[PDB]
TrEMBL record, chain A:
The lineage of its organism: Eukaryota, Metazoa, Chordata, Craniata, Vertebrata. The chain holds residues 66 to 84 of 96 of the full protein. It is found in: Cytoplasm, Cytoskeleton. This is Actin beta. Belongs to the actin family.
Length: 19, 483
């Protein structure tokens, strides 16, 4: 299928103290 | 005043850098952080940069700028819809699978464009920026916003000025979420954002690499809340131009499509170096153009995207489970899980489907309920690996007894989780019917209603499965074997 499917608003980690 | 803001941000940094105060103190901590943020916000001027025109006054400039740089700008228009906000509407019939939208890489704001911008010097010094491209994108957006001659001004001037992420909720709107799973993520998001604002407020003051930033002269809490809300609601993962790595990006024009159910139809074309979107379904002229954002839960849509989606077919809740160290078969169970690639304790999901559980959760629950003799058959002999291979397959149970025990356990546990909520499902429906609520308040109440309806469905599904396997046991049905 799509080699690079794009998920709109993909969830990222914002915890700068975790990572 | 400026020394007062420094003192206030200094206090805020220490407050939000303290360790987690304990789950029973998290609401109290949350309100304490809110009080401090609002004190700072009331002493500041809102967004540092605002624009003279209405949002729709700048969409023609967005189109002209996108057109000059090779993007599709024909066949749709910008309309402010009541339900979703601004979106795209077809001006011609668009057939399913038609390539109707494309956005070349030059128009994107990426972590890479952040490194090559005025933020470049600070990016190469601050360890949070280097490790977290999403925060890097947020500061990239803010610096270009405050740069009147930025290449990306036509995009920035069309962005929303406010969002419905929980960062924008009133205290009593978040209060509806007390005792839910989701509220801890609301707490973390708020503490994360306040800590980051205070941290970077002081970093910008102390680092010489920040001297040429517009943020050196004005960086408000509203700026940072707007920037992170912009990125969390709109960011995307795309390949690098090299193709070997992934990066985060804001994709102008295409990111104006709102969400509906379906499948992902947007991908990246490395050969033409552009984002490409084919139509998810037929769109007649005058119909809103939707895409499918992704298989996210309503908790993720609320917290990270700022909307609740009715009839989200991918909704789910969490359930944390683990083999207890006081179980006398802990060593055997841990080893079976390890050979199966499953942790001894993990956070799983319950889905709003039938079955409610994934192959990984089914496999964990089977092992969690195995007898010692069954554990030994998954650890020893020439059929052991074959047995582990089928552990996540509903068609090949370990034994009828194992199935009855695990669905009994799941029914009991999901019932127990339902009892930890402050309200019942029937109470939530009464609130939604009998009170007149804001959009944000409704998002909160529907979210807590959603968690309970998923657990209630899991209770019913587990009870039904328990009855099924108890019948096979009493009838002494031959166990299916994978052959
Ligand atoms: N199905 C839906 N219902 C309600 N709001 C939606 C939606 N799909 C997308 N949105 C809105 O669109 C945002 C993603 S960007 C889409 C364009 C946006 N409406 C704008 O005016 O710029 C979300 O954060 C949410 O505010």
């Amino acid at each position: 299928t799509l080699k690079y499917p794009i998920e709109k608003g993909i969830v990222t980690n914002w915890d700068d103290m975790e990572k | 005043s400026p020394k007062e803001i420094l003192n206030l941000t200094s206090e805020l940094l220490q407050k939000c850098s303290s360790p987690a105060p304990g789950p029973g103190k998290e609401w109290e901590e949350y309100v304490q952080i809110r009080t401090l943020v609002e004190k700072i916000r009331k002493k500041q001027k809102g967004l540092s940069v605002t624009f003279d025109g209405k949002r729709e006054d700048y969409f023609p400039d967005l189109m002209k700028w996108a057109s000059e740089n090779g993007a599709s700008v024909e066949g749709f228009e910008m309309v402010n819809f009541k339900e979703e906000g601004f979106g795209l509407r077809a001006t011609r019939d668009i057939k399913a699978e038609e390539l109707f939208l494309w956005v070349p890489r030059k128009l994107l704001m990426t972590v890479e464009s952040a490194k090559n911008s005025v933020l470049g010097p600070l990016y190469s010094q601050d360890r949070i920026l280097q490790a977290m491209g999403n925060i890097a994108l947020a500061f990239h957006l803010l610096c270009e916003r405050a740069s009147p001659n930025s290449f990306w001004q036509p995009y920035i001037q069309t962005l929303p000025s406010e969002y419905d992420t929980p960062l924008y909720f009133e205290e009593d709107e978040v209060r509806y979420l007390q005792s839910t799973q989701a509220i801890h993520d609301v707490f973390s998001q708020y503490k994360n954002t306040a800590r980051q604002y205070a941290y970077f407020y002081k970093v910008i003051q102390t680092h010489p690499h920040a001297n040429k930033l517009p943020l050196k002269d004005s960086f408000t809490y509203e700026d940072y809340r707007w920037a992170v809300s912009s990125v969390m609601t709109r960011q995307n993962q795309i390949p690098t131009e090299d193709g070997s790595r992934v990066t985060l990006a804001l994709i102008p024009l295409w990111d104006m499509c709102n969400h509906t159910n379906g499948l992902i139809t947007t991908g990246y074309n490395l050969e033409d170096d552009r984002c490409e979107c084919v139509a998810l379904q037929d769109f007649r002229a005058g119909e809103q153009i939707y895409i499918f954002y992704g298989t996210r839960s309503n908790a993720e849509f609320v917290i990270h995207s700022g909307f609740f989606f009715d009839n989200n077919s991918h909704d789910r809740v969490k359930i944390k489970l683990g083999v207890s160290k006081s179980d006398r078969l802990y060593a055997m169970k841990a080893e079976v899980l390890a050979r199966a690639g499953i942790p001894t304790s993990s956070v799983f999901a319950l889905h709003f489907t039938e079955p409610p559980i994934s192959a990984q959760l089914l496999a964990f629950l089977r092992v969690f309920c195995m007898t010692e003799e069954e554990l030994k058959e998954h650890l020893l002999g020439d059929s052991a690996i074959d047995r582990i291979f089928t552990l996540g397959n509903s068609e090949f149970p370990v034994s009828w007894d194992n199935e009855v025990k695990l669905w009994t356990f799941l029914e009991d546990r999901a019932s127990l989780l339902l009892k930890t909520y402050k309200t019942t499902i029937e109470e939530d429906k009464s609130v939604l019917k009998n009170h007149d609520l804001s959009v944000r308040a409704k998002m909160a109440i529907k979210l807590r209603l959603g968690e309970k309806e998923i657990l209630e469905k899991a209770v019913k599904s587990a009870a039904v499965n328990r009855e099924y396997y108890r019948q096979q046991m009493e009838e002494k049905a031959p166990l299916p074997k994978y052959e």
